[PDB]
Amino acid sequence: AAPQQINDIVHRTITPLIEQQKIPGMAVAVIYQGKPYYFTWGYADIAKKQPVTQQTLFELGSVSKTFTGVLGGDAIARGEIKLSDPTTKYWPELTAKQWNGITLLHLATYTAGGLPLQVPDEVKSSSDLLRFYQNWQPAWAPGTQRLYANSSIGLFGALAVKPSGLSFEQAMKTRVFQPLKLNHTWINVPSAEEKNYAWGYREGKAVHVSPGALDAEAYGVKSTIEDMARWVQSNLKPLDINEKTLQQGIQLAQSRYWQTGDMYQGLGWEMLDWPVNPDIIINGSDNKIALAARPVKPITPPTPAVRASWVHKTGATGGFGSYVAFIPEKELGIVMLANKNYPNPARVAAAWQILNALQ
Ligand SMILES: *C(=O)[C@@H](NC(=O)Cc1cccs1)[C@@H]1NC(C(=O)O)=C(COC(C)=O)CS1
Known part of the structure; x- marks a missing residue:
């Protein structure tokens, strides 16, 4: 069981949410004083x-981008890439002048x-991708x-792993999932785990996300509530991570690179200063x-x-909706x-409503 205050606010908040939104199935983790x-x-x-x-796999949708951002941060910390590097350093065939x-x-x-x-559905192979990016004209x-764009961070993830010599999936497994003991987090769900893969529901029909170019990088991770709680813990408290470049990559993904309004763009993660205006978020x-x-x-x-931040990311696919938010200063987080x-x-x-009641 949990502290009664946690049970109380969670039951009082999630129960009407499920009824109003007609959600068929839901898993929630609260990370409170670092424990799930x-x-x-x-x-x-x-x-x-x-x-x-607690073993059900959900499609994380764009929450996947947080893993991509951290993997890119780890590559920066390894000295393999720099964010100031031109795109063409890693894809020299991207010769069209707009890429300069x-x-x-x-x-x-x-x-x-x-x-x-979105990457167009018609774009599937690396040759299709090259034509897509060569024809694209910036506004x-x-x-x-x-x-916000899957075709942007998706390409970042694909290029960030090139110096390593690993595929994006292999880099993610070896450099992020395995060190953090995310043993039930998958870019591709193995056959033996399909029994744990929930169906998504769209207009009453059972659906799973379809393959697409750069899906792994932008929206393709599936995970359990337990692994996602561990992911939140790792991003809340990177100093407990033994692998130095992953610790540093987690920190780099919460660095603030751009501001628009009151929000700051990290690598995958987005941040606002805490306390937040709830209406703004x-x-x-x-x-x-x-x-x-x-x-x-x-x-x-x-x-x-910045430790006193609300750090968060939403994600969706056709049949799933996910959300993660955490406040490092308070050792507090939630996965829905x-x-x-x-x-x-x-x-x-x-x-x-849940995190503000527990702060
Ligand atoms: C990130 O979560 C993102 N999802 C994806 O691009 C992955 C998907 C695969 C199949 C369907 S979505 C954003 N999710 C959604 C959504 O509500 O599902 C978007 C809504 O799009 C418009 C247009 O409103 C934008 S992409």
């Missing part, structure tokens, strides 16, 4: 009456100048507008704002990770995994 407390509701498979458990001046930093932080939200100069998570182009101000040098893609503001409002 787990809660499950509902079904991973409705028709087959399989309950959500676009750095890894711009890719990682969605500031390359209008790379689109803005690099480093002026943030436009709730309303800012609505796709009307979160997917819009917004002007950025550079932070030179990037601010080293659900097998329905329900509106971002409802996730953020519930998470803030």
Whole structure:
């Protein structure tokens, strides 16, 4: 069991959320004074009456970008890449003139100048990808507008692993998942684990995310509530991580590279100063704002990770909705995994109500 205050706020917050949003299955972890407390509701498979458990795998959707950002941070710490490196250093075939001046930093932080939200479904092979990026015309100069984009950070992740000689999946397993003992976190779910893979539900139909180019880097990780609680713990307290470059990569992913309004862009993670205005984070998570182009101000040098921050990331696929938020100064965090893609503001409002009650 958990402290009664945790049980109380979680039951009082999540129960009406599930009823109002018609969520079939949900798992929540609260990290309180560094320790995890787990809660499950509902079904991973409705028709087959399989309950959500602490071993159920959920599609994290864009929460995957936090792993990509940390893996990139680890590569920086290893001396393998620098964020100021030009994109063309790692992909010399990207010869089109618009790529002159676009750095890894711009890719990682969605500031390359209008790379689109999605890689087109028609783009599958590395030859298709090259044609896509060679034909793309920026709307803005690099480093002026943030436009959230799988095609931007997805390319960052693919290029950041090139010096290592490893595939993106192998780099992620060897350099992030394995050192942190994330033993049930997968880019590709093995056959033997399919029994634990929840179905997502979209308009009442059971669905799983479809393959797409750069999916692993941008939205393709599946994980359990236990592994996600450990991921939060690791990002809350990197000084407990023994592998020095991973410790440093976690810190670098919470550095503040750009500001827009009151939010700061990290590597994958986004941050605001704590205490936050809850209306700012709730309303800012609505796709009307979160997917819009917004002007950025550079932070030179990037601010080293600030402990008194609200650090967070939403994620979705067609059938799933996920949210992670944590406050390093308070040793406090939350993971919310659900097998329905329900509106971002409802996730953020519930998470803030829980964490604010426990601060
Ligand atoms: C990040 O979470 C992101 N999801 C993906 O790009 C991965 C997906 C694979 C299949 C469907 S989404 C954002 N999620 C969503 C969503 O609500 O699912 C978006 C909504 O898109 C528009 C347009 O409103 C944007 S991409």
